[PDB]
Structure 1
């Protein structure tokens, strides 16, 4: 159009940091203070642990001065696995499920100085495993690898039950002899069972623990009342993994597994604040996100076409939540469609493959209707989703095996493997709402409805119940006052305050988002 010339730009010479010569003008020498490993507490529960891992477990241990921000639970037990075909090698076929400690705790209550925090570790970790940093996840649990597909076989190389000697990268393995202590009892000739001792030391994922910052969590102060109350569900379906190609004794449909000798301790650092940090501030703030199930709905999903057939012909099931009333705007949402009832106890968890999503917020309807599955994967990945597309999609993963004419039509289904399925993370900012007041942390009431279209792995002429769940992740802070009091509260502001807040495009801490 007009007269345009590129603007003048100033120049610099990019040079290696090696030429920033170290001298007396730019070098200082450090000594060090740090969190010690002396007086590291091993805390027994108030009563002898339930011998099979099932029941309430309470830790009650006042602790003076500073306490580690990411306390851990150390569990030990013996698992007896029965109904194994005689003469089975079991090589690379036995291990633990992902995050077996937190999977085993449906609800936890933590009391600090009379303030109780109720959370749901099994629900929390099922989401968290999919969009956290995998480096933090390995600090959280020795069993941090997340299943990509709905079956695991020792014949396949992507096998989390490969033992340590079969694993080049330890983070890939939930198997024996790799990240956790174990002992296999001697097996008799002709035996159809095995006993394995396990020990697992895993960070507790329960508000207000600092499970997102395991290397360097902010300590707690002066826990004069400190109780950790667990709904203990340390049972085989929560903890134990068995490859889908282990053969069964004639006449048995699944393995029978028993837990005995269950023990549990809470392990946490405890220490006196060093002289050099001076006065600890009166009021300490902790980032303690609040994860909530906002809505759910289920249906019986019947397939009439082969799930291993042409992908575009797989039955497209739809579920839509009831309207979900919220008093404020969360930071993030997560959508997943879960198989309600596992058909096997020791196999990967099954989710549906979500192929479409439509969101209504207030009067704004049909949001994301133009997205297909690859774009939904991109959306979720933009918010941290950390697994491959073939997992997310729920597609048929082993098509050659199923396209084989030597596999009779009847056995094609039995041999088919699918992606584990979808979790879709989205923020209110992803929705492009015309209502600019709907911002994360706004104290504005909203109504949301979620429609998910999805595919399921059941055979043609069969079905199963699936549940659409919509979770919120809210920014939430815990406050430690100098007199001992703890409080927690959502970080809420008016839309007008947020609209006028300065942009952040890149010792100050910024929490929330």
Structure 2
């Protein structure tokens, strides 16, 4: 054994790459112009409280922008606030309030209907996309790091523009969206705020993934967008957990009035310089499905802010989930089924253990702890920090302070928002090597999740384990106007014998 001889290179500064006539070219350009926007009104007046069917119907010739946007405006009256409350850095909007408010949507392009679930799509997509991409989808793209929001918390999403570390990554007032607070008289227990939110529609086949430079659709003889509107306070309005209530009242009462909506699209003629448009254009339009869910009452006997190891280890196991093909990715989360407080963060559980079964291969990931589960999710796109993901006590010293009495320790305690575990079939390390992403092969999956919840000792709430699948799914636009979509399925042998790409 002797070391092999290696070739050498002489590196030098890029400064010495002299610009000359041999390597410098002058660019002119064409672009998608900004003179091409159109406002599309809905077929009927939108419901005044934001609850009802909403339809846009507008044939569009030539090219239409791939990421159309919805512009909602409304007034929100918040009641049962303690008198003379400043409300500084305490009121704002929830993350992706437009898409949160649309449980189901149907898009018609030239007779082809696409049915999808925006609220469900954006609930997953907010946790595994680039934050700068997400800031182009919505002005309220920041996702809650912690299960309670307090005014003084450093990344409090309801911090105003001047009080935010990064105003783009806040959902407060004076940040990314237009607003107006109605005049507040001395001794008033309510506030009225007008909002305007301009947000991209997350629904098949829109190009919300490629929001930076979306590929346009062409020659839409029929173009209908049908929305199941649920623009209700619970989906849109955010109130910090340290805002005080009037004596007697349990929660805040919020009413949406003056609700209006329109769709904003770009429409323009293709330039001659790009040449002939191809006969068949392909669009990346992934399919998210809830593969299985199961719920249970979770009662905490021991303090969630106490010893981590003594926190109640709740277990939920799904039924056997039958799948006719193998998805590219899965997503696991344990969420509160019925929210206790309507205007607080979504209460997810901190997943401490994960057992997965695929066919007869059992007990996968049972060995793994939180740190390894965080790495797993992070390697598949998870976009938040461990402090959030873990669901652990985030302010231990604040709670352990002797100045805080035993009765006030839960109130001061703030936990990480909770876990979302993204995993691929290739992460499982299955004996059955035919179980590959995009394989046309039937499988049965079962997922057990061990988790801890942020509820106080002697209290509880219902938590649902949800397992989602993210499938590769393409939409094809044919020259004659026809649209089709289908999964990109192949045999195991085709996929295993495909050429290697080390990336």
Structure 2-normalised TM-score? 0.98
Task: Please give the secondary structure, in 2, of the residue aligned with 1:27.
Answer: coil
SS at the partner of 2:25? strand
Structure 2 unaligned blocks of 5 or more: none
Q: What are the superposed Cα offsets for residues 203-225 of structure 1, whole Å, 9 maximum, x if unpaired?
A: 11001000011121000000110
Shift of 1:246: 1.0
Deviates most, 192-201 or 10-19? 10-19
The aligned length equals 503
| Shift of residue 12, structure 1, vs aligned partner | 1.4
Number of the residue aligned with 2:7: 10
Q: Distance in 1 between matches of 2:115 and 2:6?
A: 56
Change (3 A) 1:410 1:168: closer
> Does the 8 Å CA contact 2:155/2:164 hold for their aligned counterparts?
no
The alpha carbon displacement at 1:158 in A equals 2.1
Of 407, 410, 415, which aligns to 1:410? Answer: 407
- Residue 171 (structure 1) shift: 2.5
User: In 2, distance between residues paired with 1:160 and 1:144?
Assistant: 10
- Contact kept in structure 1, 2:155 and 2:165, CA below 8 Å: no
Query: 1:291 Cα deviation (Å)?
Result: 0.5
Q: How does 1:267-306 map to 2 (within 5 A)?
A: 267-306=264-303
Distance 1:132 1:404 in 2: 38
Mapped contact 2:38–2:265 kept (Cα < 8 A): yes
Q: How far off is 1:401 after superposition?
A: 2.6
Alpha-carbon separation, structure 1, partners of 2:401 and 2:4: 64
Q: CA RMSD in A?
A: 1.0
Q: CA deviation at 1:382?
A: 0.5
CA positional deviation for 1:415: 2.7
- Three-state SS of the structure 1 residue aligned to 2:339 is coil
**Post-superposition offset of 1:397:** 1.5
More moved, 401-410 vs 417-426: 401-410
> What SS is found at the alignment partner of 2:343?
coil
Distance 1:232 1:238 in 2: 11
Q: What TM-score comes out, normalization by structure 1 length? A: 0.97
**Post-superposition shift, 1:405?**
3.1
In the alignment, the residues of structure 2 paired with residue 33 and residue 16 of structure 1 have an alpha-carbon distance, to the nearest angstrom, of 33
CA distance in 1, matches of 2:355, 2:225: 40
2:50 alignment counterpart: 53
Q: Hey, what's the Cα distance between the residues in 2 that align with 1:14 and 1:132?
A: 36
Q: For residue 459 of structure 1, report the CA deviation from its aligned partner.
A: 1.9
Between stretches 12-21 and 171-180, larger displacement belongs to: 12-21
Deviation at 1:316, TM superposition (A): 0.5
Q: Quote the offset at 1:452 in angstroms.
A: 0.4
Distance 2:11 2:290 in 1: 51
**Partner Cα separation in structure 2 for residue 166 and residue 306 of structure 1:** 33
- d(CA) in 1 for partners of 2:360, 2:12: 55
> Displacement of 1:252 after TM fit?
0.9
CA contact (8 A) 2:160 2:167 kept: no
Q: Matched residue of 2:494: which SS? A: helix
Q: CA offsets, 1:43-62, max 9 Å, x none?
A: 10000111111111000011
* Alpha-carbon distance in structure 2 between the residues aligned to 1:15 and 1:110: 55
How far did residue 463 of structure 1 move?
1.8
Structure 1 residues 482 and 331, CA, compared in 2 at 3 Å: closer, same or farther?
Answer: same
Q: 1:115-145: CA deviations, max 9, x gaps?
A: 1111111111111111100110011111111
Distance in 1, Cα, partners of 2:460 & 2:231: 30
Per-residue deviation at 1:81? Answer: 0.8
Select which of 150, 169, 174 maps to 1:177: 174
**Unaligned ranges ≥5, structure 1:** 507-513
Q: Deviations over 1:163-211 (max 9, x none)?
A: 1111241222100011110011111121111111111101110010000
- Counterpart position of 1:80: 77
CA distance in 1 between counterparts of 2:52 and 2:382 reads: 33
Q: How far 1:38 moved relative to its partner?
A: 1.4
1:319, CA displacement in angstroms? 0.7
C-alpha distance in structure 1 between counterparts of 2:204 and 2:11, whole Å: 46
Shift, 1:39, TM fit: 2.8
- Once residues 301 and 74 of structure 2 are traced to their aligned partners in structure 1, the CA distance between those partners, rounded to angstroms, is 44
- 1:396 is displaced (CA, Å) by 1.4
1:292-338 Cα deviation digits (max 9, x unpaired): 00001111112121111100001111111111110111000000001
CA distance in 2, matches of 1:351, 1:94: 21
Q: Deviations over 1:235-270 (max 9, x none)?
A: 111000011111111111111111111111110100
Work out the CA distance in 1 between the residues paired with 2:420 and 2:128: 9
Q: After superposition, what is the alpha-carbon deviation per residue over 1:44-101, rounded to whole angstroms, capped at 9, x for unaligned?
A: 0000111111111000011000000000011111111111111111111110001111
- SS of 2:151's equivalent in the other structure is coil
Structure 2 Cα separation of the partners of residues 314 and 329 of structure 1: 36
Q: Distance in 2 between matches of 1:184 and 1:458?
A: 33
d(CA) in 2 for partners of 1:341, 1:443? 37
